[PDB]
Amino acid sequence: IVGGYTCGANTVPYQVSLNSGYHFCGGSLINSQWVVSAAHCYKSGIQVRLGEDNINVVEGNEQFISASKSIVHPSYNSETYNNDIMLIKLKSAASLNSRVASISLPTSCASAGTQCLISGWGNTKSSGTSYPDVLKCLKAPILSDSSCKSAYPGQITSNMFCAGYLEGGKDSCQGDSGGPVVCSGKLQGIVSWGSGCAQKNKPGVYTKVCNYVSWIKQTIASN
Ligand SMILES: N=C(N)c1cccc(O[C@H]2CO[C@H]3[C@@H]2OC[C@H]3Oc2cccc(C(=N)N)c2)c1
Ligand SMILES: [Ca+2]
């Protein structure tokens, strides 16, 4: 997260870290047994880390649970990141508490201009590199589809939306991928892709979760 702020420990209780010996992507807890992330975060050997603030220090509220199954969206296209969504089942149910909590799925898509909360442990610099150990947060509005598609002609599908600031300065970044965009209490986006981080006229691109709620619900109920 570039241009954001330290969230505060466990203030984003649905945020998970995906760990394969190291943090490599975010995710969102949607019930005690399932996490939603980005398909481009797929790998085998995932451990889900819940209750995290400092990902390098055991602070006392963590739950570390191995993934038992990963399900990449059937239509994920790795060249274009169209349908950049994946489900991860936990080998054992998380113990839900005030620091380890699910986020609701949308019942409808969110409209342009709605303010959202984006969070993660990604790079915090727009030139160069600095990775935080505590969770970072950013408030950012959903941008119009026209502004999104103007920034990335040819590359935005109906399964994507842009959020952030055309002036630059404030964006998600490498290492935030797979993490949440929460708007009005609903998981509306997944950190997916962009051009650099926090550059002028190149807002972040997010998987449009409202298009996937039927697939999510049917998939989890059958697995
Ligand atoms: N600035 C950001 N908000 C952001 C967030 C996550 C990742 C990120 O950058 C990485 C760099 O490599 C990946 C992801 O962003 C770009 C590329 O994926 C795509 C996706 C869709 C189309 C194509 C394409 N070039 N045709 C590339 C930045
Ligand atoms: Ca920790």
Which of 129, 192, 193, 206 for mutating ligand 1's site (highest number of atoms within 8 Å of CB)?
193
Distance CA 125, CA 110 (A): 29
**Are 126 and 192 in the same domain?**
yes
Q: Which atom of ligand 1 is nearest to the CA of 196?
A: 1
**Are 135 and 195 in the same domain?**
yes
* Angle at CA of residue 71, ends 76 and 16, nearest 5°: 100
**Are 42 and 3 in the same domain?**
no
Distance CA 193, CA 203 (A): 9
Distance CA 147, CA 167 (A): 12
Distance CA 151, CA 86 (A): 26
**Are 195 and 110 in the same domain?**
yes
Ligand nearest to the CA of 17: 2
SS (H, E, C) the chain: CECCEECCCCCCCCEEEEECCCEEEEEEEEECCEEEECHHHCCCCCEEEECCCCCCCCCCCCEEEEEEEEEECCCCECCCCECCCEEEEECCCCCCECCECCCECCCCCCCCCCEEEEEECCCCCCCCCCCCCCCEEEEEEECCHHHHHHHCCCCCCCCEEEECCCCCCCECCCCCCCCEEEECCEEEEEEEECCCCCCCCCCEEEEEHHHHHHHHHHHHHCC
Name the one residue in this structure whose structure tokens are 């941008």. Answer: 143
Q: Whose Cα sits closest to atom 27 in ligand 1?
A: 80
Find the CATH number of the domain harbouring 8: 2.40.10.10
In the PDB record, what is the listed experimental method?
X-ray
**Are 6 and 31 in the same domain?**
no
* N residues, the chain: 223
Edge to edge, the sheet with strand 115-120 lists 5-6, 136-141, 115-120, 180-183, 186-193, 204-208, 160-163
**Are 107 and 1 in the same domain?**
yes
* Angle at CA of residue 207, ends 98 and 20, nearest 5°: 60
**Are 35 and 115 in the same domain?**
no
**Are 8 and 109 in the same domain?**
yes
For residue 161, give its domain range. 1-12+103-210
**Are 75 and 166 in the same domain?**
no
User: How many domains is the chain built from?
Assistant: 2
Ligand 1 near 197 CB (within 6 A): yes
**Are 96 and 198 in the same domain?**
no
**Are 143 and 47 in the same domain?**
no
Radius of gyration over every alpha carbon of the chain, rounded to an integer in angstroms: 16
**Are 4 and 107 in the same domain?**
yes
Distance CA 71, CA 88 (A): 6
